[PDB]
Amino acid sequence: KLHKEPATLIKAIDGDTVKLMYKGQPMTFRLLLLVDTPETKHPKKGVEKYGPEASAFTKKMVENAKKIEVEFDKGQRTDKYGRGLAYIYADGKMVNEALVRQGLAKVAYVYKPNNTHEQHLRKSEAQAKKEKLNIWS
């Protein structure tokens, strides 16, 4: 079973990459199962169509949260770049899914066993497509 753990915001970096104080140590966390478009991609040098709105949305959601919690999946907790891989919740709402529901990020990098909430995010993504939101307009 997965479970939520306390984390302190240190800084939001873009739509899907946030730096958090987790168990007393500063580290970059990357949101599982998403590809926010970037604010500072690498092919793209930077700023994507919808990458800066996905960044603003996560920035406000974590900045204004009363509390942040991280939820690791059941596979590896870290990727090759040493970023923590988690579902992040702000006030009990999953930032991963809110981005996807808004049509501000797409579901991507699905590596089992790290896909417990994959179907939940694919649903939210289907609805953002139906309603034609943002990247899907």
Ligand X SMILES: Cc1cn([C@H]2C[C@H](OP(=O)(O)O)[C@@H](COP(=O)(O)O)O2)c(=O)[nH]c1=O
Using CB under 6 A as the binding rule, whether residue 45 contacts ligand X is answered as no
Sequence-distant (≥ 6) Cβ neighbours of residue 123 within 8 angstroms? none
Residue with the shortest CB distance to Ca ion: 38
5: left (phi over 0), alpha (psi -120 to 50) or beta: beta
* CA 51 – CA 105 distance, rounded (Å): 8
Which listed range, 55-63, 106-114, 115-123, 124-132, lies at the site for ligand X (CB under 6 A)? Answer: 106-114
Question: Contact between 52 and Ca ion (CB under 5 A)?
Answer: no
36 is in an annotated binding site: yes
Residue 73 labelled as part of a binding site? no
Does 26 sit behind a cis peptide bond, omega within 30 degrees of 0 on the bond before it?
no
Name the residue among 71, 1, 65 with its Cα closest to residue 31: 71
28 with 11: CB under 8 angstroms? no
H-run or E-run covering 51: helix 51-63
Q: Would you count residue 73 as binding Ca ion (CB under 5 A)?
A: no
Shorter beta-carbon distance to ligand X: residue 49 or 130: 49
Catalytic annotation, pick one of 5, 63, 71, 83: 83
Binding site for ligand X (CB under 6 A): 17, 30, 32, 35, 79-80, 85, 109, 111, 114
Chain contacts with Ca ion (rule: CB under 5 A): 14, 16, 36, 38
Q: From the annotation, which residues make up the binding site?
A: 16, 36-37
List the catalytic residues.
30, 39, 83
